[PDB]
Design a protein around this ligand. Structure first.
Ligand SMILES: Nc1ncnc2c1ncn2[C@@H]1O[C@H](COP(=O)(O)OP(=O)(O)O)[C@@H](O)[C@H]1O
Ligand SMILES: Nc1ncnc2c1ncn2[C@@H]1O[C@H](COP(=O)(O)OP(=O)(O)O)[C@@H](O)[C@H]1O
Ligand SMILES: Nc1ncnc2c1ncn2[C@@H]1O[C@H](COP(=O)(O)OP(=O)(O)O)[C@@H](O)[C@H]1O
Ligand SMILES: [Mg+2]
Ligand SMILES: [Mg+2]
Ligand SMILES: [Mg+2]
Lengths: 372, 372, 372
């Protein structure tokens, strides 16, 4: 083949393009939007459903659904609209000509991967495809064969240890807390300063407040004290319609949910303890190299101060005699897709695709014997 | 102390009285009103503002302002008249004599609770006070350590799950739709039958139409079909001055907004879906006992048929494997205040009051470190 | 004494009672749990810690901690709550009056036995005590003085060869895989069918799924092929909250971790290989009588088909010239406690107790010269 696609069919935001390009060709919301009002205009070019940037643009008149929840596809009829849009609108390919690398979280339901395999061969007729783990792809972008990858998206956070190119699948950790739960918690805490955000259109406004204003405080109790000497840490922000809102300790109490999942009431260890537990499930000789190669990936790792905070916290859990080093590159917003564009381009990978001629004799069950 | 005051400082309607009474000593409109017409009579007892039953009585000559919107005090200069009137006129006690229990919605703005705290210690000089969640009080009145309380007053509808007396604040739900929004919708749909209601006093006339004649259908499409065999479900009502109006399917299409908020153009779950979502956000082992102890509170839960409609709808959402039971007691019009009268009476509660001596060294910020 | 106590302080299930009784007087979860939510009701039995069935019953609002991990007590402040509950709450004895037989896995830390001795004399003031090896007690319940015992609890699996009443301590094997690791692996593989169990309360739901439905395949590859021609091996389970989960090959792929520890990623012999390797470490003349007396003990030996599988596999490793018999009694769930109740009742054992008079001139290091 001369060109494959790589599609990072993620929660909240899809990244899409071709193998061997250095960054995604297309990046848009993993959203389908549907009207919630009467179509009172006549001769208007009214469309029954909107997807990606069209839905994000028109959202005052729409109800917005993400067809992926926690890295699991929950609405296949609208997920087919996202893949149809992806290929025919801004990639503008013929899917029958290009083999597609697809992307998934570890410890997902098998039925997700099977129906995703079925749609690619039976609805899009692709030549071939493969499903790769987001955290395995994240080491190709880094240029490594050992590291522990913390990947944190819109839906799921997960840790995957790799040493000398072998995964330790028994030491993988998954966590149903990422960019959506932080946005919902930001909506909840913004209520107590007097602002209301509740519609699926207002959750997108609060996602922009989260992306623009929020950060990870290197010591939470000292930052909560600092914010009581107020206006020192406060930022103003301008809503659609031009009303201004101001934010204080909620600017960093929001991202702290990653380190203290008890803020959203769940009983699980923080992302620091989860990375440390994942290294401690690994065999003793590999732990020293995993601590030094603690890779970060995905948009929920983009906060200011989060690499510093997690270096402070893994260094408090690990023994003091060795170098915890956290590798947070500036393109980590796309390092899954970038690593998929490398893998789909490798000359040795071209024998590993599931081909149409191998699917159609074995059914969607083929994807469990041929993929990790 | 020998007695304590207790107030549900309600949206639309205040309830007030003393600890250990089995019902409120006073219940009256949460209203202040000012003249909108000339005082032409010389030697008249002319007065520049009115409150409660006095404003409700003079409402031909007044414009009526509710100083509480959606459970938030939006007009302190008139809310201070409501609290002043409450203590000095129909409770007729000196506020410095008795500590006050006070009442709030969950997820409210912190500035509301702070300013309420300040006014009680600095305008009314009370010995001590506390602020309690309307739904936590409703389990004291119902005699339970566990339940999910749907509370629906004039201004707000909210759900609080409680199990073994511990609340789950991650699973709390709040909804800016209750008795006011149903009254505004009733003005709009009575206008489809040609009746005009637009002044604030006409909203009180339409509120009496709602309170006297409205009800919840067990199945809306069957009731809308039944109303096409007309004059069966329809009723007649007598206005002030003695004119009469006849009320059609708007008699049950009004309360159905609680189950279909899209009738008033907002994009949110109905009260059945939001109570189910609140149970489904809880820890799995507690859900069986929340379905069995679903408690109704506040005047917007007083419609005929609402318990039967909600038992039907929650039974359709929940798995059939277990017994949904909705506890709608007849005193649920006052169950918040009744629960406060129990809480203020308990010997083990008297250490939980914020005392004047504990406020004046910490300011109104004391309330967030002693209330829920 | 007229009665001693015997307390099999095992991982995650404590079995306790009097010497001379035929079964444990008390059996309960070896668990302590603490609230993880705000207590909003007051005038109530609010309690800062729950233990045993109180923790297991209220688990929907608790984080649950096991104070024993792999047969090692890791949290003594909660193990003292388990013994205090054992003695005062449902044995309802005064410990000062009764000598107590305690119990431990072989190849444990010496400090675990020392601190366990210290607490019994300095916190509970017992007249005397002893620490027995759980596999030596499994021969006492079995009514034989030669055999090899596969004991497998919640924390640890171990083999102890005994011939003519002498143990062969060079031939003891210990494996840090038993009922907890199988439960945790079932949480992992249930995720691949779409069910997330993640809290320490949901781990108890998965432990009940494991106990009710899981079984050991006689031939794993034949059973996997049988489950691929599906629906014949599937069963379903009703959760708390009344949602139903169906379970298929994960019903027997879970217990196969005992025969293939590489499923949880650990490098070791399976329980068949570890038992055979233990017989091979023994002196050649005893091996015939060890194969003829392969005793099984503890709850992780309770799966349907495990005796048939374990006999099938030892019979393939051992030479065909002689007969393997596996002795898996129907009471084997309590055979350590039953055998401890026999040992503590023997007239020949009453010289072997460590007495308070013999502890308080030697310190807790007495337990290394007087016990096993
Ligand atoms: N600069 C930023 N600060 C904070 N959050 C961000 C930033 N950029 C993106 N995000 C968040 O990252 C989440 C998804 O990013 P991504 O890694 O693409 O996840 P996914 O792989 O699930 O699509 C979104 O919820 C978005 O709000
Ligand atoms: N019989 C009734 N039918 C319908 N609505 C009622 C009835 N009685 C009271 N209400 C409504 O209940 C609302 C407030 O009741 P209440 O429970 O006191 O709320 P709050 O606690 O907010 O004061 C008012 O808007 C009123 O219209
Ligand atoms: N019928 C059963 N089938 C499978 N596992 C069981 C059964 N009964 C008990 N267990 C398991 O046995 C384990 C502990 O049993 P036990 O022998 O008391 O161990 P311990 O001595 O460590 O307390 C628990 O993890 C439980 O899940
Ligand atoms: Mg991602
Ligand atoms: Mg109320
Ligand atoms: Mg045991």
């Amino acid at each position: 083949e001369t060109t494959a696609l790589v599609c990072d069919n993620g929660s909240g935001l899809v990244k899409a393009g071709f193998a061997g390009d250095d960054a995604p060709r297309a990046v848009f919301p993993s959203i389908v939007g549907r009207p919630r009002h009467q179509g009172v205009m006549v001769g208007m070019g009214q469309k029954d459903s909107y997807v990606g940037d069209e839905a994000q643009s028109k959202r005052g008149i729409l109800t917005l659904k993400y067809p992926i929840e926690h890295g699991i596809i929950t609405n296949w009829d609208d997920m087919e609209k996202i893949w149809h849009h992806t290929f025919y609108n801004e990639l503008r390919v013929a899917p029958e000509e290009h083999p597609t690398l697809l992307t998934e979280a570890p410890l997902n339901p098998k039925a997700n991967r099977e129906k995703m395999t079925q749609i690619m061969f039976e609805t899009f007729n692709v030549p071939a495809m493969y499903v790769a783990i987001q955290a395995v792809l994240s080491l190709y972008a880094s240029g490594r064969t050992t590291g522990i990858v913390l990947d944190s998206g819109d839906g799921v956070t997960h840790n995957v240890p790799i040493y000398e190119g072998y995964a330790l699948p028994h030491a993988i950790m998954r966590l149903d807390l990422a960019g959506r739960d932080l946005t919902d918690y930001l909506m909840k805490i913004l209520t107590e300063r007097g602002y209301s955000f509740v519609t699926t259109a207002e959750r997108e406004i609060v996602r922009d407040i989260k992306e623009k204003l929020c950060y990870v405080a290197l010591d939470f109790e000292n930052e909560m004290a600092t914010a009581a000497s107020s206006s020192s840490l406060e930022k103003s922000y301008e809503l659609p319609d031009g009303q201004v809102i101001t934010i204080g300790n909620e600017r960093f109490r929001c991202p702290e949910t990653l380190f203290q999942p008890s803020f959203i009431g769940m009983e699980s260890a923080g992302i620091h303890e989860t990375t440390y537990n994942s290294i401690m499930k690994c065999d003793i000789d590999i732990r020293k190299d995993l601590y030094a190669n603690n890779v970060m990936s995905g948009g929920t790792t983009m906060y200011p101060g989060i690499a510093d905070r997690m270096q402070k916290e893994i260094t408090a859990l690990a023994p003091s005699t060795m170098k915890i080093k956290i590798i947070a590159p500036p393109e980590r917003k796309y390092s899954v897709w970038i690593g998929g564009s490398i893998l789909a381009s490798l000359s040795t990978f071209q024998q590993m695709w599931i081909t149409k001629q191998e699917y159609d004799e074995a059914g969607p069950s083929i994807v469990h014997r041929k993929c990790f």
